[PDB]
Design an enzyme around this catalytic site. Structure first.
Site, PDB file in Angstrom:
ATOM      1  N   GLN A   1       0.806  -1.211   0.000  1.00 46.95           N
ATOM      2  CA  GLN A   1       0.000   0.000   0.000  1.00 46.95           C
ATOM      3  C   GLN A   1       0.843   1.266   0.000  1.00 46.95           C
ATOM      4  O   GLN A   1       0.290   2.360  -0.191  1.00 46.95           O
ATOM      5  CB  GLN A   1      -0.916   0.023   1.218  1.00 46.95           C
ATOM      6  CG  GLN A   1      -0.186   0.243   2.529  1.00 46.95           C
ATOM      7  CD  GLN A   1      -1.082   0.047   3.737  1.00 46.95           C
ATOM      8  OE1 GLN A   1      -1.380  -1.073   4.127  1.00 46.95           O
ATOM      9  NE2 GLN A   1      -1.529   1.138   4.321  1.00 46.95           N
TER      10      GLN A   1
ATOM     11  N   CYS B   1      -5.100   0.649   3.789  1.00 47.54           N
ATOM     12  CA  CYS B   1      -5.132  -0.746   4.193  1.00 47.54           C
ATOM     13  C   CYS B   1      -6.519  -1.351   4.015  1.00 47.54           C
ATOM     14  O   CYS B   1      -6.657  -2.526   3.641  1.00 47.54           O
ATOM     15  CB  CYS B   1      -4.722  -0.852   5.653  1.00 47.54           C
ATOM     16  SG  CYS B   1      -5.753   0.153   6.791  1.00 47.54           S
TER      17      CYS B   1
ATOM     18  N   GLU C   1      -6.878  -4.837 -11.117  1.00 40.64           N
ATOM     19  CA  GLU C   1      -5.619  -4.180 -10.792  1.00 40.64           C
ATOM     20  C   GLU C   1      -4.894  -3.752 -12.053  1.00 40.64           C
ATOM     21  O   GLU C   1      -4.383  -2.630 -12.143  1.00 40.64           O
ATOM     22  CB  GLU C   1      -4.756  -5.158  -9.982  1.00 40.64           C
ATOM     23  CG  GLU C   1      -3.495  -4.580  -9.382  1.00 40.64           C
ATOM     24  CD  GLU C   1      -3.765  -3.794  -8.121  1.00 40.64           C
ATOM     25  OE1 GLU C   1      -3.925  -2.565  -8.232  1.00 40.64           O
ATOM     26  OE2 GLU C   1      -3.819  -4.401  -7.017  1.00 40.64           O
TER      27      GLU C   1
ATOM     28  N   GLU D   1      -6.958  10.176  -6.068  1.00 42.58           N
ATOM     29  CA  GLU D   1      -7.205  10.913  -7.295  1.00 42.58           C
ATOM     30  C   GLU D   1      -8.697  10.837  -7.614  1.00 42.58           C
ATOM     31  O   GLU D   1      -9.469  10.147  -6.943  1.00 42.58           O
ATOM     32  CB  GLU D   1      -6.355  10.336  -8.442  1.00 42.58           C
ATOM     33  CG  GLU D   1      -4.898  10.814  -8.427  1.00 42.58           C
ATOM     34  CD  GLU D   1      -3.889   9.688  -8.622  1.00 42.58           C
ATOM     35  OE1 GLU D   1      -2.859   9.922  -9.293  1.00 42.58           O
ATOM     36  OE2 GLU D   1      -4.111   8.573  -8.100  1.00 42.58           O
TER      37      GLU D   1
ATOM     38  N   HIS E   1       2.246  -0.890  16.975  1.00 50.41           N
ATOM     39  CA  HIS E   1       3.317  -1.166  17.919  1.00 50.41           C
ATOM     40  C   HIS E   1       4.580  -1.519  17.151  1.00 50.41           C
ATOM     41  O   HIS E   1       4.521  -2.168  16.102  1.00 50.41           O
ATOM     42  CB  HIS E   1       2.918  -2.309  18.861  1.00 50.41           C
ATOM     43  CG  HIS E   1       1.736  -1.983  19.719  1.00 50.41           C
ATOM     44  ND1 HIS E   1       0.441  -2.269  19.336  1.00 50.41           N
ATOM     45  CD2 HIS E   1       1.651  -1.380  20.926  1.00 50.41           C
ATOM     46  CE1 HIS E   1      -0.390  -1.849  20.278  1.00 50.41           C
ATOM     47  NE2 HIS E   1       0.320  -1.310  21.253  1.00 50.41           N
TER      48      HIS E   1
ATOM     49  N   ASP F   1      -9.278  -0.748  19.871  1.00 54.70           N
ATOM     50  CA  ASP F   1      -8.714   0.364  19.113  1.00 54.70           C
ATOM     51  C   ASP F   1      -7.934  -0.216  17.941  1.00 54.70           C
ATOM     52  O   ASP F   1      -6.706  -0.289  17.958  1.00 54.70           O
ATOM     53  CB  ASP F   1      -7.807   1.199  19.997  1.00 54.70           C
ATOM     54  CG  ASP F   1      -8.553   1.865  21.130  1.00 54.70           C
ATOM     55  OD1 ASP F   1      -8.036   1.859  22.268  1.00 54.70           O
ATOM     56  OD2 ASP F   1      -9.658   2.392  20.881  1.00 54.70           O
TER      57      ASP F   1
ATOM     58  N   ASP G   1      -6.602  -0.148  14.033  1.00 56.94           N
ATOM     59  CA  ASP G   1      -6.120   0.921  13.169  1.00 56.94           C
ATOM     60  C   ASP G   1      -5.623   0.414  11.817  1.00 56.94           C
ATOM     61  O   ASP G   1      -5.093   1.208  11.034  1.00 56.94           O
ATOM     62  CB  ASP G   1      -5.005   1.737  13.856  1.00 56.94           C
ATOM     63  CG  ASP G   1      -3.763   0.904  14.174  1.00 56.94           C
ATOM     64  OD1 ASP G   1      -3.715  -0.283  13.816  1.00 56.94           O
ATOM     65  OD2 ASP G   1      -2.822   1.461  14.787  1.00 56.94           O
ATOM     66  N   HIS G   2      -5.778  -0.868  11.508  1.00 52.84           N
ATOM     67  CA  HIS G   2      -5.168  -1.429  10.310  1.00 52.84           C
ATOM     68  C   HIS G   2      -6.020  -2.586   9.813  1.00 52.84           C
ATOM     69  O   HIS G   2      -6.334  -3.500  10.573  1.00 52.84           O
ATOM     70  CB  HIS G   2      -3.745  -1.902  10.646  1.00 52.84           C
ATOM     71  CG  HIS G   2      -2.976  -2.421   9.472  1.00 52.84           C
ATOM     72  ND1 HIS G   2      -2.898  -1.739   8.278  1.00 52.84           N
ATOM     73  CD2 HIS G   2      -2.215  -3.529   9.324  1.00 52.84           C
ATOM     74  CE1 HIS G   2      -2.159  -2.432   7.430  1.00 52.84           C
ATOM     75  NE2 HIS G   2      -1.711  -3.508   8.048  1.00 52.84           N
TER      76      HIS G   2
ATOM     77  N   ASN H   1      -0.703  -9.252   5.096  1.00 57.55           N
ATOM     78  CA  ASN H   1      -0.578  -7.810   5.241  1.00 57.55           C
ATOM     79  C   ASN H   1      -0.402  -7.191   3.848  1.00 57.55           C
ATOM     80  O   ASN H   1      -0.335  -7.904   2.840  1.00 57.55           O
ATOM     81  CB  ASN H   1       0.582  -7.507   6.202  1.00 57.55           C
ATOM     82  CG  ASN H   1       0.537  -6.106   6.773  1.00 57.55           C
ATOM     83  OD1 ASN H   1      -0.379  -5.334   6.524  1.00 57.55           O
ATOM     84  ND2 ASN H   1       1.556  -5.771   7.549  1.00 57.55           N
TER      85      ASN H   1
HETATM   86  C1  LIG Z   1      -4.982   1.645   7.354  1.00 54.30           C
HETATM   87  O1  LIG Z   1      -4.043   1.975   6.352  1.00 54.30           O
HETATM   88  C2  LIG Z   1      -5.749   2.871   7.816  1.00 54.30           C
HETATM   89  C3  LIG Z   1      -4.795   3.930   8.376  1.00 54.30           C
HETATM   90  C4  LIG Z   1      -5.494   5.133   8.933  1.00 54.30           C
HETATM   91  C5  LIG Z   1      -5.759   6.304   8.283  1.00 54.30           C
HETATM   92  N1  LIG Z   1      -6.386   7.180   9.126  1.00 54.30           N
HETATM   93  C6  LIG Z   1      -6.543   6.586  10.353  1.00 54.30           C
HETATM   94  C7  LIG Z   1      -7.110   7.067  11.526  1.00 54.30           C
HETATM   95  C8  LIG Z   1      -7.140   6.232  12.632  1.00 54.30           C
HETATM   96  C9  LIG Z   1      -6.613   4.948  12.567  1.00 54.30           C
HETATM   97  C10 LIG Z   1      -6.040   4.476  11.397  1.00 54.30           C
HETATM   98  C11 LIG Z   1      -5.997   5.293  10.269  1.00 54.30           C
HETATM   99  N2  LIG Z   1      -6.745   2.489   8.817  1.00 54.30           N
HETATM  100  C12 LIG Z   1      -8.066   2.610   8.640  1.00 54.30           C
HETATM  101  O2  LIG Z   1      -8.571   2.979   7.583  1.00 54.30           O
HETATM  102  C13 LIG Z   1      -8.940   2.240   9.841  1.00 54.30           C
HETATM  103  N3  LIG Z   1     -10.298   2.755   9.699  1.00 54.30           N
HETATM  104  S1  LIG Z   1     -10.975   3.712  10.816  1.00 54.30           S
HETATM  105  O3  LIG Z   1     -12.317   3.258  10.999  1.00 54.30           O
HETATM  106  O4  LIG Z   1     -10.083   3.746  11.936  1.00 54.30           O
HETATM  107  C14 LIG Z   1     -11.050   5.347  10.133  1.00 54.30           C
HETATM  108  C15 LIG Z   1     -10.078   6.227  10.525  1.00 54.30           C
HETATM  109  C16 LIG Z   1      -9.992   7.480   9.942  1.00 54.30           C
HETATM  110  C17 LIG Z   1     -10.871   7.862   8.973  1.00 54.30           C
HETATM  111  C18 LIG Z   1     -11.906   6.993   8.548  1.00 54.30           C
HETATM  112  C19 LIG Z   1     -12.832   7.366   7.548  1.00 54.30           C
HETATM  113  C20 LIG Z   1     -13.830   6.515   7.166  1.00 54.30           C
HETATM  114  C21 LIG Z   1     -13.957   5.267   7.756  1.00 54.30           C
HETATM  115  C22 LIG Z   1     -13.080   4.862   8.721  1.00 54.30           C
HETATM  116  C23 LIG Z   1     -12.020   5.705   9.146  1.00 54.30           C
HETATM  117  C24 LIG Z   1      -8.946   0.713  10.063  1.00 54.30           C
HETATM  118  C25 LIG Z   1      -9.716   0.350  11.333  1.00 54.30           C
HETATM  119  C26 LIG Z   1      -9.497  -0.027   8.844  1.00 54.30           C
HETATM  120  C27 LIG Z   1      -9.888  -1.461   9.130  1.00 54.30           C
END
Ligand SMILES: *[C@@H](O)[C@H](Cc1c[nH]c2ccccc12)NC(=O)[C@@H](NS(=O)(=O)c1cccc2ccccc12)[C@@H](C)CC
Length: 220
Positions: free
Chosen positions: A19, A25, A86, A96, A140, A160, A162-163, A187
């Site tokens: 990515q 992700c 792809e 974009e 982490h 919590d 984030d990925h 991943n």
């Molecule tokens: C993974 O590459 C991506 C990284 C990312 C980008 N912005 C954030 C903010 C907080 C945590 C991680 C972040 N992770 C995600 O897209 C997550 N989605 S989310 O629900 O935390 C989220 C965060 C920020 C904006 C938006 C907008 C729309 C929908 C969700 C989110 C993870 C959990 C994806 C599984």
């Protein structure tokens, strides 16, 4: 359920992708799950366009490199009536304007299924459906430096996440601590990360890193 599952041996899984420096992700997780379900239907494994999702699924709630959700991606594919390959819509690691072309659509879905927030339910889905989109707490240093073995981070959060990543199976191996079960996770950080781009994440350890907390797959 079976004690071990690996959908890569059945042809459900494309090579590991990268990515780049973009928070997309969720799009790689979504394409991974849809690649698996499309293969289940047609017997043809076709790599799908994460860029299509990054550029075009804003109306479903996604935010490109600024975050998103796999379920919103599955909804886009259904609402939009397709998703490009792809090869036809390659990945650029930056958001974009939408360039979707229906002539090059190679996948569809009719919605999605959210799995109960229990590792037993995730195991049943992995065993019977195929690769499953999941969200984890990957924030982490131990995750960045992972090389082999079963990943366990005592400070990982089950709430919590984030990925977004892809569970392609599960299994076991003997360990010092006798915490021997793992989820096999693809991943999207390239093949130089982890074990050829994969990680074995602790399984049945109180929903470690939240892997069962936001699991889903598309309906094809
Ligand atoms: C993974 O590459 C991506 C990284 C990312 C980008 N912005 C954030 C903010 C907080 C945590 C991680 C972040 N992770 C995600 O897209 C997550 N989605 S989310 O629900 O935390 C989220 C965060 C920020 C904006 C938006 C907008 C729309 C929908 C969700 C989110 C993870 C959990 C994806 C599984």
């Amino acid at each position: 359920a079976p004690r071990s599952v690996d959908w890569r041996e059945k042809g459900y899984v494309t090579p590991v992708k990268n990515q780049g420096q973009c928070g997309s992700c969720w799009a790689f997780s979504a394409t991974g799950a849809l690649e698996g379900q499309m293969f289940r239907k047609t017997g043809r494994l076709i790599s799908l366009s994460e860029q299509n999702l990054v550029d075009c699924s804003g109306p479903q709630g996604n935010e490109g490199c600024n975050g998103g959700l796999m379920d919103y991606a599955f909804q886009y594919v259904q609402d939009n009536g397709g998703l490009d390959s792809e090869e036809s819509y390659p990945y650029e690691a930056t958001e974009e304007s939408c360039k979707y072309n229906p002539k090059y659509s190679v996948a569809n879905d009719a919605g999605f299924v959210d799995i109960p927030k229990q590792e037993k339910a995730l195991m049943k889905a992995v065993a019977t459906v195929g690769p499953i989109s999941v969200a984890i707490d990957a924030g982490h240093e131990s995750f960045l430096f992972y090389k082999e073995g079963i990943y366990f981070e005592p400070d990982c959060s089950s709430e919590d996440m984030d990925h977004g990543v892809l569970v392609v199976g599960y299994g076991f191996e003997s360990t010092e601590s006798d915490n021997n079960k793992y989820w096999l996770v693809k991943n999207s950080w390239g093949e130089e990360w982890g074990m050829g781009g994969y990680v074995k994440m602790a399984k049945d350890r109180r929903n470690h890193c939240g892997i069962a907390s936001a699991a889903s797959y598309p309906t094809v």
